[PDB]
Symmetry: C2
Subunit: 227 residues, 2 copies
Amino acid sequence: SLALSLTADQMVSALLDAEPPILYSEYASMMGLLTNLADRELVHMINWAKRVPGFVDLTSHDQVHLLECAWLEILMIGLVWRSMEHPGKLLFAPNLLLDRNQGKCGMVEIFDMLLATSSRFRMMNLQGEEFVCLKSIILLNSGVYTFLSSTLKSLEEKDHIHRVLDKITDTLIHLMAKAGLTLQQQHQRLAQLLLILSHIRHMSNKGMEHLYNVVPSYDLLLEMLDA
Amino acid sequence: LALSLTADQMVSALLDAEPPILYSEYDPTRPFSEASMMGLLTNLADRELVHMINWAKRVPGFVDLTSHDQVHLLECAWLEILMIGLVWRSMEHPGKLLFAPNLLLDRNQGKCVEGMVEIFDMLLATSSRFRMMNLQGEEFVCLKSIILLNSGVYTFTLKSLEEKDHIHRVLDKITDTLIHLMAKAGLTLQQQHQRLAQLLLILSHIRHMSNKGMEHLYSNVVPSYDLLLEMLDA
């Protein structure tokens, strides 16, 4: 796979080039606007995912499983990235900057978790090159432990995913070493960034929990991938 | 004193703190009903929770926190901690979850409860991943401690900012310990950081299993804040 031959800078360059644009809110019903926004973001997310090195080496069934498990975490981590420069606020779009008081509409509990994630990123001085690495880890990791098959192909697919995840780890480390971090600082920061992904999983599970609907089904994702 | 520990002293402290393995209620009526299986598992978990507080109080740095923050971390982490212990106990039993030495269950037995074959399958996949990574006991105790300190830290004045900093400093210390363990084992630098990432990434899966375990549940057996607090003071 081409992905496994990439250097750290080529991997970063590929991911930076795949970044979807920042969409605007069309306009009210909170769910209304957020739903309209997320629906337009998902279309760009499928095209982004097709451009993550290694992803299209997988079967369509496995690409859908990964997206089904990761899509809300991917939307949330984009939101948190957008919001770093707005302490106390969530920048859903450039024309939809919501503060905490506008979550009281069980939405506040998740707003708070999202704000805490944005704060953490700010604290850490999270860089854009690191963000795109983290977003692609979410895509490949979130669903990998729940492939439901035991065929040779499934084993080969999971093994490919883990080698791409290793490549992204190497990339994260190279970015930090090139920024001047000591060997120990490199390990510590890699771990800090990966541990935040556990909180993003938690937030996504909450959001799903309170929802239960408007979730993209397996069949919906398969068709968007086929097009 | 916790941040002054060497990597070597950290592993020795975590290994010494480690809780006993408990038995399920002896000679339960078999085959199980959904209610009787949930009864056995709840009784096992309730007894394990007592020893989890004892272990937690011995995790370097945990007891430097206020009691409130200690309870908050245990409330957030308790089921994840129980599940990683289950996954570890079960590594040497493919196809099977060793809930206790006298309670080894195969996948068909997870079907007795509604929706708990799904989780049951998720736990089996984790034990297989640990088996295939050949996870070592010293790594397991570091990972269980990371879960305790990490799961609740992002859901907490200067005092609060200092508590979090202390937690992130202890987490760094446990990270350095994991790396130290992999270096002494002979892993290249590249292999060290890749293995660290692989282990930390499995923790997001454990979070997912704990979340689903709760959701299925809700579809009073959870330990209360007051209960956790009472056990921490005694």
